[PDB]
């Protein structure tokens, strides 16, 4: 289905601390008020969704059913790929070739170790009576791989009306060609969401502690364009100038007068007799 | 040496000084870089090749060399950009009855390519009759055994060789040198370098709340104001050592 991502998907673009200032960054973000793909689970769904640029994965999960993610473009041992899982109190991010099955499950069934190339171990990313929100921004840039995270309580299904930044949980410089991702979980009433990040220019309001407290998009609506032009949140009454209305070209034209001279190649190639 | 092992090394800082601080590694022939210089240098991947040879065949582990080891067992390319480490080990690698756990390829139809490994034991058909897998006239087993003995000659005494190759090619560096954290001088004006962040000014003690993942601190005009101490997760303000316009 479709839902509304009102104001969600704001991650710290830089490890640079600030205070009480506003910083008009311009990076790959998830635009405000976007129709995001909604799923939920006898009935289920598990396609192979394309990892176009960046996915604001959200999971209003009652009790930690989602079990990792799988990324890549082929996922059949032909191309180097990766697997991220969430063990009871640990996680593993490996980079191997893999061969999967239609219904891998536990009480798994796939080639976990094949032509491997990278491994990772850490604490359980999915910490743990509320359907705790588990936002994760998955993105790759310049041959690096970035993830973000957040863990907030949820009372009782649609995204809340609130703003929460996302710390950079873990970085990992893998740098492989990726196109399509697939989520992983186990059933034996949980929703997983997939947005799509797009190049965009944002305003962010760092608080007195370097923590983000509010954000404004430049390209959303005229008033937001003013806000992003004055570099301020409140806008005093007036008439401001923000940008330049410009029309774009439509098609392509090439011109040249009628051509009359053709090189006499036939007389050489189709000659009746060649010289010695 | 014919079945040389290769240990790929990554996700780690290599203290080269440790092995450089050991006389037994007498033979430390490197080519293309300086050991001391690379201890502040970084690479994407490192490969550690180890094998055992005789006393005098250490020269064969070198670019542009020839011989049984160089042509059939372990060939280095002409454009070698790494180090060679070799030492004598008569105690462990040798035995009183002679060691039979060692083999060197003696016959092969064609010289190896650089860093090629060959573990196939197929009779070297030197003549024109097929061998069918049994040794005989013009049919030789590819490998033979070194008779390492305690009383053997130095040129025949055992020798362990470790070859390090460095390839930082289009890959996020995973191996750098452990440049020791140098001293920190506070309240006296200095020139500083903090994890690739190298300005000039006086270091001081800070009190500004810093989020743990945050590293730097920028003021209005993107000036590096606060810097996380790399070892201890504390914060050092950088306000230029006290100054104020001089008028006479």
């Amino acid at each position: 289905a479709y839902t509304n991502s009102f104001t969600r998907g704001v991650y710290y673009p830089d490890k640079v601390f600030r205070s009480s200032v506003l910083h008009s960054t311009q990076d790959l973000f998830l635009p405000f008020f976007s129709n995001v793909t909604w799923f939920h689970v006898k009935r289920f769904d598990n396609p192979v969704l394309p990892f176009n640029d960046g996915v604001y994965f959200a999971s209003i999960e009652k009790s930690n059913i989602i079990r990792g993610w799988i990324f890549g473009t082929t996922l059949d041992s032909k191309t180097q790929s990766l697997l991220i899982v969430n063990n009871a109190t640990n996680v593993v991010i490996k980079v191997c070739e893999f061969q999967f099955c239609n219904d891998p499950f536990l009480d798994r069934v796939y080639s976990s170790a094949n032509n491997c190339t990278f491994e990772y171990v850490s604490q359980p990313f999915l910490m743990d009576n509320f359907k705790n929100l588990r936002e994760f921004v998955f993105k790759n840039i310049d041959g690096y791989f970035k993830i973000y995270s957040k863990h907030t309580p949820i009372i009782v299904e649609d995204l809340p009306q609130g703003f929460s930044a996302l710390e950079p949980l873990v970085d990992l410089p893998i740098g492989i060609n990726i196109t399509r991702f697939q989520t992983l979980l186990a059933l034996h009433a949980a929703a997983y969401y997939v947005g799509y990040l797009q190049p965009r220019t944002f305003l962010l309001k760092y608080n007195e502690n370097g923590t983000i407290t509010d954000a404004v998009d430049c390209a959303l609506d005229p008033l937001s364009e003013t806000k992003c032009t004055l570099k301020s949140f409140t806008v005093e009454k007036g008439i401001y100038q923000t940008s330049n209305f410009r029309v774009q070209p439509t098609e392509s034209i090439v011109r040249f007068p009628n051509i009359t001279n053709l090189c006499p190649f036939d007389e050489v190639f189709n000659a009746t007799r060649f010289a010695s | 040496v014919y079945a040389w092992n290769r240990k790929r090394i990554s996700n780690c800082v290599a203290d080269y000084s440790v092995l450089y601080n050991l006389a037994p590694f007498f033979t430390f022939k490197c080519y293309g870089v300086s050991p001391t210089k690379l201890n502040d240098l970084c690479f994407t991947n490192v490969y550690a090749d180890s094998f055992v040879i005789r006393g005098d065949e250490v020269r064969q582990i070198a670019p542009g060399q020839t011989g049984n080891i160089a042509d059939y067992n372990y060939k280095l390319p002409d454009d070698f950009t790494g180090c060679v480490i070799a030492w004598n080990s008569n105690k462990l690698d040798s035995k009183v009855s002679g060691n039979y756990n060692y083999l060197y390829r003696l016959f092969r139809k064609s010289n190896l390519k650089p860093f090629e490994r060959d573990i196939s034991t197929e009779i070297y058909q030197a003549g024109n009759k097929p061998c069918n897998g049994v040794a005989g006239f013009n049919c030789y087993f590819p490998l033979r055994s070194y008779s390492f003995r305690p009383t053997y000659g130095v040129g025949h005494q055992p020798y362990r060789v470790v070859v390090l190759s460095f390839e930082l090619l289009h890959a996020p560096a995973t191996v750098c040198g452990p440049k020791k954290s140098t001293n920190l001088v506070k309240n006296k004006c200095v020139n500083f370098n903090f994890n690739g962040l190298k300005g000039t000014g006086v270091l001081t003690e800070s009190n500004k709340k810093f989020l743990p993942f945050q590293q730097f601190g920028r003021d209005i005009a993107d000036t590096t104001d606060a810097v996380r101490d790399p070892q201890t997760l504390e914060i050092l303000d950088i306000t230029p050592c006290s100054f104020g316009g001089v008028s006479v």
Partner: antibody
Amino acid sequence: QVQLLESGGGLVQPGRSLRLSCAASGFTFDDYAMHWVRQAPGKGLEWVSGVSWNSGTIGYADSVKGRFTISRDNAKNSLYLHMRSLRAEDTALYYCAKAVEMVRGLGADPEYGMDVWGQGTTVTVSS
Amino acid sequence: DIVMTQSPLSLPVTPGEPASISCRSSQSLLHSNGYNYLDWYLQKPGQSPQLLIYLGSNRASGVPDRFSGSGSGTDFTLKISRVEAEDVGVYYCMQALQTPFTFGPGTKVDI
């Protein structure tokens, strides 16, 4: 699950060669010392050969020394056992076993603890 | 080049009682670390053998706590605190100090 598959059995005349192959799947190949152990028909076990984590062999049986040749390949997770000078007294099963202690996990490096065993082949010799 | 022996050669055990088997060597297996390198293995008839005890007395993983290993120097003992109907087969002791390794002749336990 950890898997040890061996192949290479078959009737061969005396005075020939063979090459058994053992394939490992389900663990990091370079942190376990592999072993080759025979099993004669209706008799006890008998150690044959072994290999450390760094592809360094650790000697062969006293009565077989001179013909057998072991080799390792961590890239393909493949262990091989070239066999020479085949005689009628070499007919037996052959398991490839694995060590238990991972290297550098605690004095010296471990070589004991043959815990996991694949189903051996049925190499035989006769004329 | 070390030769080991076991005793008794073959002993009948009945389910519900302890049993004791001794493995003896020629050279003491005490290493510089002080650890014994003898290991106990059970090769059930018709099935691939299994590990029972490694490093002298350190219990192997996944086996019940009904087995006990003791001894040092040149004499080691394996005691099954309680025997049942699934404790029949052949037992061996294998050295792990001086290469090449060896396996004892074997004790045959039955009902």
